[PDB]
Write a protein that binds this ligand. Structure first.
Ligand code: 3PH
Ligand code: Y01
Ligand code: Y01
Ligand SMILES: *[C@@H]1O[C@H](CO)[C@@H](O[C@@H]2O[C@H](CO)[C@@H](O)[C@H](O)[C@H]2NC(C)=O)[C@H](O)[C@H]1NC(C)=O
Ligand SMILES: *[C@@H]1O[C@H](CO)[C@@H](O[C@@H]2O[C@H](CO)[C@@H](O)[C@H](O)[C@H]2NC(C)=O)[C@H](O)[C@H]1NC(C)=O
Ligand SMILES: *[C@@H]1O[C@H](CO)[C@@H](O[C@@H]2O[C@H](CO)[C@@H](O)[C@H](O)[C@H]2NC(C)=O)[C@H](O)[C@H]1NC(C)=O
Ligand SMILES: *[C@@H]1O[C@H](CO)[C@@H](O[C@@H]2O[C@H](CO)[C@@H](O)[C@H](O)[C@H]2NC(C)=O)[C@H](O)[C@H]1NC(C)=O
Ligand code: TYI
Lengths: 470, 464
């Protein structure tokens, strides 16, 4: 209707000169299609397929939670095993993966003949209540680790007379409690054990000989590096919590050396990062360093281990009339019975759980980032040089978003001075990075920050973040 | 030289089923659960969004049998709202809306086809754009060769995606039989009922994205075999089957992953196959690629048949709507669809059109039913073989306005931009359509370009 009809087109468009060119156009089309396909395949094979997931276990994903004295976790009277079942929705909010339960077996005193590692104390609960606790945590996806130090009431924790009977009853307790369905064990104070190096290997051989989904944790009180490495001669798959980190530490150039030296001596294995074997952070730290260490322990390459109350900044040296090994947990304001009024509103679980600038509001975001992102999970660690008093490092896995953590353990304000100059071509830092959080209030969240004029306040830590690029 | 009538019932069910079932059932269960909290509330959102679409599909079957002309939802607007508010829909659908929902689906096809080669890592950009372009350029040539070929492609790929979804239902109904029943009995652990207004209606919004595209058989009417019987019969067969399959597949998603395993994922079908196969787990992203290869073939057909029909009236240039005889296919409309689709491979951010897509979608479906009830009184003499009882449009027509209100108040800054893009079709209208008697510097050029394209493609006008 705006051109030729049928018959005029069948007149003009049927001649040589017009049919050869349209067959040439068909030739050009089906030659361009195969050229595009060849270009695509050539682009594909000249690329980087992928890396490898390193086949993680359950204790590689998040943090463990140590509950020492079970009577003081909830309170008097209801200090039993079934009461803890009413608390698992708090722990699942903390996103811990494990639960290092305290020693619950019957131990009177130094009488070896009446310490039975298979019989639960009647003041904690009964076997069916224990199994209900286990299966409820299994439904909540939390694993239960059972401590098994025999003398958990004496001074010498390993029964300072002969060693064969206690070593053979601990060995016998593993093959019963594993059939009960527990997911690991912890043995504390192994420096009070005669020839402990050859005993841990037998228990580790037994524990892995039930499944590869089983754990053994071992705890000392030694800060010696060369004593720690001797425990890890024939044991490589052991978790060894100790007092290696704390000991000192108003400087950050000394903490950087501790972390780098422990990683270099071990051969970059899987380690546990904690401050003690049974004590809280406030026993070694001031209140002005609880956030800097909480940022550090969640980003270092290993498994962080915490005790109960390390998320709320609990302190036994603020309320008198309390033991130093087992403080009371501050659930609500009416918790502590004696001296009615010393407990404050910023000191409890309920008081900090709405304030978005507390300790419990930082622990939740950090445990949210640790168990989720593939850089902090099984990435590579590279710490680099900075100013006088800065600990600065980078986690980078393959192509996920990198993390640059910058910590200032000092008390004076200063610059950053990020002279990297050695970091590899797969992880060299850009000119602009984001900012996921900060330890101190008084910054803005989400903004792309520049790493040349970054200044830092006293006792400040930052969790900047940049994605994979050139 | 008419087109044909060669689409039966079974070729009509495939055009609807293969276009509804795309990549929504393999992605959006994260989104509806993330904005709904509980599995049991999502499992009833995915039926409340289903019956809504069954209602609207029945009302479009009414409108299709009444006004039995092709290019539906544009011929139904041209009869009612005139020439200019039909040109205003046809101008948006050829510039933005149709040549983005084909490039996006081709890109999904490409990035899921090369997924078994790159797991822990993502596929390369220039290696996926080229496979998307090959997917478009092969299917346009298959469609230009014949129509009976382009129907048997869609018949194969609709059955392929149906078998792929039935595989997931069968893998779920074994884990139901293995007694791992941690969900679906002790449920409603969140219930997520009300933040201020926006908790149940946003789940409805995402579930209604998952059910889209049930009105493409109206774009291909005046080409069905017996369209007075088969056009509502294909829709009535096609829609509740999609409803039951979409419910059963989401039910099978909850017996494998927990809630947090589903919320932090990127593709629930990939994590489903990772759990239940381990080895031979490369089947599931292959079948997602086949499921997105069927839909591009389904959409090129209807977009070509819409831009065909829109030039018979004079809204579009007249080189379009010219059949090539012998292998009677509208070649210069398919060429135009394909080229305008490949022009969106130069945009570096293409997923930023889905909001305007959904808003424009629900607005034009509202306009259509308003026009249907406005014409049912204004011309009560037409032949209506299938007549619908009222308040099935009215409950649909109020809920469409509520969905325009939701789409408008979720991002106004982009919806106003899209409103300006809609308003940008007026000078084209007054230059080409309304300004009759163009000067001879143009009327010779238009005719000579049409003759040049005719001598290139060997096409005659449509005269039967
Ligand atoms: C790659 C080419 C493949 C061929 C397939 C067809 C391609 C052309 C489709 C054009 C679609 C444009 C839509 C908007 C047009 C405005 C609406 C309108 O004006 O009313 C109809 C109106 C009615 O005219 P009628 O043809 O007399 O009915 O047509 C015009 O007014 C034409 C004047 C405006 C034309 C603007 C077109 C701009 C793109 C030109 C592309 C040229 C390709 C040449 C290919 C061969 C090269 C050797
Ligand atoms: C993602 C990739 C790996 C899948 C490729 C899809 C199909 C396997 C390809 C292969 C060849 C293609 C087509 C090539 C041409 C034929 C001719 C056709 O037969 C006729 O021409 C009908 C004859 C008649 O007119 O009567 C049968 C199907 C069809 C469209 C083929 C259907 C399948 C296509 C689209
Ligand atoms: C960018 C745009 C302007 C280029 C458009 C050119 C077309 C893409 C070319 C490619 C090859 C051409 C043609 C090559 C040969 C003809 C004749 C035709 O052969 C027959 O008619 C056989 C009869 C039958 O099979 O029944 C096959 C399709 C057709 C129209 C082709 C349609 C597409 C043409 C016009
Ligand atoms: C578990 O430890 C035992 C020994 O502690 C290993 O078994 C064998 O022990 C004898 C002596 O007790 C050696 O002479 C054998 O060579 C040991 N067999 C080996 C090394 O294959 C046993 O191998 C350990 N378990 C595992 C899984 O290594
Ligand atoms: C770990 O704790 C013990 C007990 O306080 C420290 O002292 C040792 O005590 C035992 C008796 O239980 C003695 O047999 C040892 O001789 C003591 N050790 C030394 C070095 O004399 C022990 O020092 C602590 N470890 C560290 C590293 O301080
Ligand atoms: C592990 O630590 C040592 C010292 O703490 C690093 O230094 C090397 O030490 C050896 C002998 O101890 C010397 O022969 C090398 O010259 C030292 N190299 C450097 C660069 O100082 C050692 O490099 C660390 N291991 C790794 C793999 O870096
Ligand atoms: C809870 O809040 C009280 C009230 O602000 C804190 O008491 C303040 O302590 C700082 C130093 O620790 C003093 O500089 C302020 O003068 C104190 N305020 C008042 C009103 O005396 C208390 O320290 C907070 N709790 C904890 C655990 O830090
Ligand atoms: N529901 C389809 C997506 C889709 C939406 C619309 I709106 C549409 O017109 C078409 I065709 C397809 C899917 O499952 O991906």
């Amino acid at each position: 209707f705006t051109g030729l009809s049928k018959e005029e087109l069948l007149k003009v468009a049927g001649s040589p000169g017009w049919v050869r060119t349209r067959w040439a156009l068909l030739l050009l089309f089906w030659l361009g299609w195969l050229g595009m396909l060849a270009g695509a395949v050539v682009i594909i094979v000249r690329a980087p397929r992928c890396r490898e997931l390193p086949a993680q276990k359950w204790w590689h994903t998040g943090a463990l939670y140590r509950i020492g004295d079970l009577q003081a976790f909830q309170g008097h009277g209801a200090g039993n095993l079934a009461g803890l079942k009413g608390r698992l929705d708090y722990l699942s909010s903390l996103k811990v993966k494990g639960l290092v339960l305290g020693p619950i077996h019957k131990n009177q005193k130094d009488d070896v003949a009446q310490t039975d590692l298979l019989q639960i104390d009647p003041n904690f609960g009964s076997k069916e209540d224990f199994d209900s606790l286990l299966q409820s945590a299994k439904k909540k996806s939390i694993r239960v680790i059972l401590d098994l130090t025999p003398n958990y009431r004496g001074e010498n924790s390993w029964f300072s007379t002969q060693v064969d009977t206690v070593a053979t009853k601990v060995k016998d307790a593993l093959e019963f409690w594993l059939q009960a369905g527990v997911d690991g064990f912890q043995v504390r104070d192994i420096e009070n054990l005669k020839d402990a190096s050859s005993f841990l290997a037998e228990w580790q051989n037994i524990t892995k000989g039930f499944s590869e989904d089983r754990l053994l944790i071992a705890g000392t009180n030694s800060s010696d590096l060369q004593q720690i490495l001797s425990l890890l001669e024939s044991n490589k798959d052991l978790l060894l919590t100790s007092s290696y980190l704390s000991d000192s530490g108003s400087t950050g150039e000394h903490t950087k050396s501790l972390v780098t030296q422990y990683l270099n001596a071990t051969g970059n294995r899987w380690c546990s990062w904690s401050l003690s074997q049974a004590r809280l952070l406030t026993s070694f730290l001031p209140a002005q360093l609880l956030r800097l260490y909480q940022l550090m322990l969640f980003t270092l390459p290993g498994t962080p281990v915490f005790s109960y109350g390390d998320e709320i900044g609990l302190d036994a040296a603020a309320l008198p009339g309390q033991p130093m090994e087992a403080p009371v947990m501050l659930w609500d304001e009416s918790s502590f019975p004696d001296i009615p009024g010393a407990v404050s509103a910023n000191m409890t679980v309920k008081g900090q759980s709405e304030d978005p600038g507390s300790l419990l509001s930082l622990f939740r975001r950090l445990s949210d980032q640790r168990s989720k992102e593939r850089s902090l999970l099984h990435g590579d660690f590279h710490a680099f040089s900075a100013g006088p008093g800065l600990f600065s490092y980078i986690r980078h896995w393959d192509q996920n978003e990198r993390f640059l953590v910058v910590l200032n353990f000092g008390d004076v304000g200063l610059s950053a001075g990020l002279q990297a100059s050695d970091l590899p071509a797969s992880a060299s830092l850009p000119a602009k990075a984001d900012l996921l959080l900060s330890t101190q209030p008084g910054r803005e969240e989400g903004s792309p920050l520049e790493l040349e004029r970054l200044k830092l306040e006293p006792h400040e830590g930052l969790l900047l973040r940049f994605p994979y690029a050139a | 030289v008419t087109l044909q009538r060669n689409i039966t019932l079974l070729n009509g069910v495939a055009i609807i089923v293969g276009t509804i079932i795309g990549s929504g059932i393999f992605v959006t269960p994260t989104g509806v659960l993330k904005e709904a909290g509980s599995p049991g509330l999502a499992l009833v959102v995915w039926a409340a969004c289903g019956v809504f679409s069954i209602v609207g599909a029945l009302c479009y079957a009414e409108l299709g049998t009444t006004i039995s002309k092709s290019g539906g939802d544009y011929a139904y607007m041209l009869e009612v709202y005139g020439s200019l508010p039909a040109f205003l829909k046809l101008w948006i659908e050829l510039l933005i809306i149709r040549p983005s929902s084909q490039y996006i689906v081709a890109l999904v096809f490409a990035t899921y086809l090369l997924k078994p080669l790159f797991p822990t890592c993502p596929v390369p950009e220039e290696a996926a754009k080229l496979v998307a372009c090959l997917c478009v350029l092969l299917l346009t040539a298959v469609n230009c060769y014949s129509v009976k070929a382009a129907t048997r492609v869609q018949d194969a790929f609709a059955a392929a995606k149906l078998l792929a979804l039935a595989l997931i239902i069968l893998l779920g109904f074994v884990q139901i039989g293995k007694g791992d029943v941690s969900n679906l009995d002790p449920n409603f652990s969140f219930e997520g009922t009300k933040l201020d207004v926006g908790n149940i209606v946003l789940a409805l919004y995402s579930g209604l994205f998952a059910y889209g595209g049930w009105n493409y058989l109206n774009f291909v009417t005046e080409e069905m075999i017996n369209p007075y019987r088969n056009l509502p019969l294909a829709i009535i067969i096609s829609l509740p089957i999609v409803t039951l399959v979409y419910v059963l597949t989401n039910l099978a998603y909850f017996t494998t992953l927990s809630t947090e395993q589903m919320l932090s994922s990127e593709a629930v079908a990939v994590d489903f196959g990772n759990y239940h196969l381990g080895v031979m787990s490369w089947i599931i992203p292959v079948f997602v690629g086949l499921s997105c290869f069927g839909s591009v073939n389904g959409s090129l057909f209807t977009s070509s048949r819409l831009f065909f029909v829109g030039s018979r009236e004079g809204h579009l240039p007249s080189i379009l709507s010219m059949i090539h005889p012998q292998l009677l296919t509208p070649v210069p409309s398919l060429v135009f669809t394909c080229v305008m689709t490949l022009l969106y491979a130069f945009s570096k951010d293409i997923f930023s059109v889905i909001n305007f897509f959904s808003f424009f979608n629900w607005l034009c479906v509202a306009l259509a039913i308003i026009g249907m009830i406005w014409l049912r009184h204004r011309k009560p003499e037409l032949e209506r073989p299938i007549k619908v009882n009222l308040a099935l449009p009215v409950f649909f027509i109020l809920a469409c306005l509520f969905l325009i209100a939701v789409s408008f108040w979720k991002t106004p800054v982009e919806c106003g931009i899209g409103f300006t893009i809609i308003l940008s079709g007026l000078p084209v209208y007054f230059f080409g359509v309304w300004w009759k008697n163009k000067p001879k510097w143009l009327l010779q050029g238009i005719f000579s370009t049409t003759v040049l394209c005719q001598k290139l493609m060997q096409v005659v006008p449509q005269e039967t």
